[PDB]
Amino acid sequence: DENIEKIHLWEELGPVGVRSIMDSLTEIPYLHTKSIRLWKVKAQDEGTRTICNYMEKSKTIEYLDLMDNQVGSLGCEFLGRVLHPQIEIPLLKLKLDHNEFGTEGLMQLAAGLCMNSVLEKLSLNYCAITAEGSKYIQQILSFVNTNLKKLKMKGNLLKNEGVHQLFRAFKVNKTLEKVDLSDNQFDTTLGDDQDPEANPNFFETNKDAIEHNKQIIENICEVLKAADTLLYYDFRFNNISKTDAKAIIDCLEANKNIYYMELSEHIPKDLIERKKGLMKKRKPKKKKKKKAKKK
Amino acid sequence: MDNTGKLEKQLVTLNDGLPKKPAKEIIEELKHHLYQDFQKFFSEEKKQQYQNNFALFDRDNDKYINLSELKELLTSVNITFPDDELEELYNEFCLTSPEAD
Amino acid sequence: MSKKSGKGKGKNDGDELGAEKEQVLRTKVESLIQRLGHEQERADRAKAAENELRARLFDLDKD
Amino acid sequence: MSKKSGKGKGKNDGDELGAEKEQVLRTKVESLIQRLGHEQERADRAKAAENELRARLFDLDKD
């Protein structure tokens, strides 16, 4: 005599099957559902629109999970439209990993989600989000209204321009808690061009890229210094230079509230040890689950 | 029976409907609806006019205007407001952008 | 231990064969799901390596 | 006409239960095999794409 409050399945359901299931859900007053998790069930456009109609008719779904489901452009259109702010949708945490929707999909989401005010955790990792589309996220951070928690940006094509735009946005953002941008092709190290005698003039022409990277790292330092809330970071599988590593090490010294961070593996080993030792003091104290004596 | 009471003075305790999601977006709704006013009430002509006028104002193309230039833009649109309150509003919004001039 | 004193029990042949078929089907399904999981893991690894290469391939080009 | 005479044939519930459960297991095998084929094609293509990404390294260095 229980109800379907959380859904978690891992088998492909087919567009016809998913559509019929979700439309039957919509036509049934089933408001007990609170979470649904599917990886690669491939809801796609039709399934996504079905869940959108169900959500708008019921307005009771709170958790969702759609990784590796191959959500297309029209699927992102549905996701953006159903996420309107007058819908009053109870969705809590959103995740669309393994979905190469790109800039088109990210814009379709941002249609309503760029200024949406519902979720807690939204993940789009391994989505190859293009750097240009990061402008949309730029509009999300410049907003002064802020009661969301998480944003995952690992494994996309945001790149150096994306990181600069994100840090510009952070310059005004005062409430971000955890951010993950690793594995995003972000190239800080110029490369192996460390023997100048091989190319004597390589320094003269290399003015824009190096100055831009130094500006990016300086903005990173300023954001981390002024960041009174953001304390979770991930830079794994990224191209982070040793000089940038040492600069970040020196800069983070002032902001000691950061309870977790990540850096690329090829950063200086001594700098890695220094960062680990410094952040050891910053680990949050695990709050014991208060076990109320049932009576 | 026997008038064994008993009325209860129902004090609505502040322990219901506490928001759960701390610090990224969830207030985004309010201003969004406010935006819909100029996402509704206003013709796009004034939107384009203000876009171009500010881009003219944004001499450095930084999307931002300082105190003097913000008063510039307000006056150019025929805004008549006391110095003080506009000053506090600008200060609040600059606090919302601590790392932006 | 060594004797073959198998009294002539004529148990239900049909039910035993049906149970054998159902057990075969369950074993086949579990093996299929195992292979599906490993193949999905390998494909995910391959795609992650592809994205890694797209970000990578820098040292030799710069050389 | 086929209106009223739904006579209470005493058909064996267990026999059809076994038959349709074997039917369901066979459909499950078909679906699992198709999914495994799709994912194995995906994994092989991803492996070839990563190899040919190191071969984008190869193509760069061969140019």
Automatic annotation (TrEMBL), chain A:
The domain of life for this entry's organism is Eukaryota
**Signal peptide, first to last residue:** none
- Keywords, alphabetical: GTPase activation, Leucine-rich repeat, Repeat
Q: Which GO cellular component terms are attached?
A: cytosol; nucleus; perinuclear region of cytoplasm
User: Could you tell me where the Basic residues compositional bias lies?
Assistant: 277-295
- Got any disulfides in this one, which pairs? 221-251
**Molecular functions per Gene Ontology:** GTPase activator activity; small GTPase binding
Start and end residues of each stretch annotated as Disordered: 274-295
Query: Which Pfam family name is an example for this entry?
Result: LRR_6
What does the record list as GO biological process?
Answer: nucleocytoplasmic transport
Q: What is this protein called?
A: Kinase domain protein
- Identify the species of origin: Tetrahymena thermophila (strain SB210)
What taxonomic classification does the UniProt entry list for its organism?
Answer: Eukaryota, Sar, Alveolata, Ciliophora, Intramacronucleata
TrEMBL record, chain B:
Q: Which UniProt keywords apply?
A: Acetylation, Calcium, Metal-binding, Repeat
Q: Which domain of life is it from?
A: Eukaryota
The record places domain EF-hand at 45-80
Keyword Disulfide bond listed? The answer is no
- GO CC terms, sorted: myosin II complex
Any one GO molecular function term: calcium ion binding
| The name this protein goes by in its record | Calmodulin
Q: Which organism is it from?
A: Tetrahymena thermophila (strain SB210)
What fragment of the whole protein does this chain represent?
1 to 101 of 202
